[PDB]
Amino acid sequence: VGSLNCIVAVSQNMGIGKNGDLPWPPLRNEFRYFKRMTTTSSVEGKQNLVIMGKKTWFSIPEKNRPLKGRINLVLSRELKEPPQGAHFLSRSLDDALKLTEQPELANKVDMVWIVGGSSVYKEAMNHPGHLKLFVTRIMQDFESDTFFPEIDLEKYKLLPEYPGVLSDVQEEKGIKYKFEVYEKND
């Protein structure tokens, strides 16, 4: 199993969602970036694994579920089996990461991408180890009801650039945004 990563798009006020939807109007190229980053695997014969909470899973339009070309794992203690369309279910993040080491997945998974929501991001971000955060900064305030956890910049270094990630300002639907990559190792 390869690297562990979080990927998120976040407003200036740290918003990531409002009532199970994104706080801002759809940004087509931003979604294309998410798709490209989470799907693209460095290793031949492997796929990336996406880990998400239950509410995040059900926030994805049914047409886009499961995220194609990726192994889809849902976190829940209430569910008794993976949701329709999903591949795996784990009770905890630690359990999910342990599963990747089991003979059923260790040979199949390259990168692991945590794609939400708030509590899953928080635990990953505060757990010792090598972790990258791929953060799209939506450069406006948007009314939100769930939020990205604090990024401790003493720990998370903003990288000056990263291959495959544009460094300049993007704009769709009159909304400016930019792509960032953070890395810790503790």
Ligand X SMILES: COc1ccc(OCCCCC(=O)O)cc1Cc1cnc(N)nc1N
Residue number, 108 or 122, with CB nearest to ligand NDP: 122
Size of the site for ligand X (CB under 6 A): 16
Question: Residue 19 Cβ, how far from ligand X at the closest point, in Å?
Answer: 14
Contacts with ligand NDP in 1-20 (CB under 6 A)?
8-9, 16-17, 20
Active-site residue (options: 4, 27, 30, 67): 30
CB proximity list for 8: less than 8 A, separation 6 or greater: 16, 115, 116, 121, 133, 134, 135, 136, 148
Long-range contacts of the stretch 76-85 (C-beta < 8 A, 24+): 78/54, 79/54, 83/54, 83/57, 83/58
Minimum distance of ligand NDP from residue 23's CB (angstroms): 8
Closer Cβ to ligand NDP, 25 or 43, answer by number? 25
User: Which of these ranges, 26-34, 85-93, 144-152, 159-167, lies near ligand X under the rule CB under 6 A?
Assistant: 26-34
Has 4 been annotated as catalytic? no
CA distance 99 to 56: 20
Contacts of 127 (CB under 8 A, 6+ apart): 93
The Cα 22–Cα 142 span in angstroms is 9
Q: Is 147 an interacting residue with respect to ligand X (CB under 6 A)?
A: no
Per CB under 6 A, contacts with ligand X among 60-119 are 60, 64, 67-68, 115-116
Q: Are 134 and 179 in contact (CB under 8 A)?
A: yes
Residue with smaller CB distance to ligand NDP, 79 or 105: 79
Active site residue 133: no
148 vs 184, which CB is nearer to ligand NDP? 148
- Count of H helices and E strands in the chain? 4, 11
**CA–CA distance, 55 with 77 (Å, rounded to integer):** 12
Name the residues that contact ligand NDP, by CB under 6 A. Answer: 8-9, 16-17, 20-22, 52-56, 59, 75-79, 91-93, 115-120, 123, 146
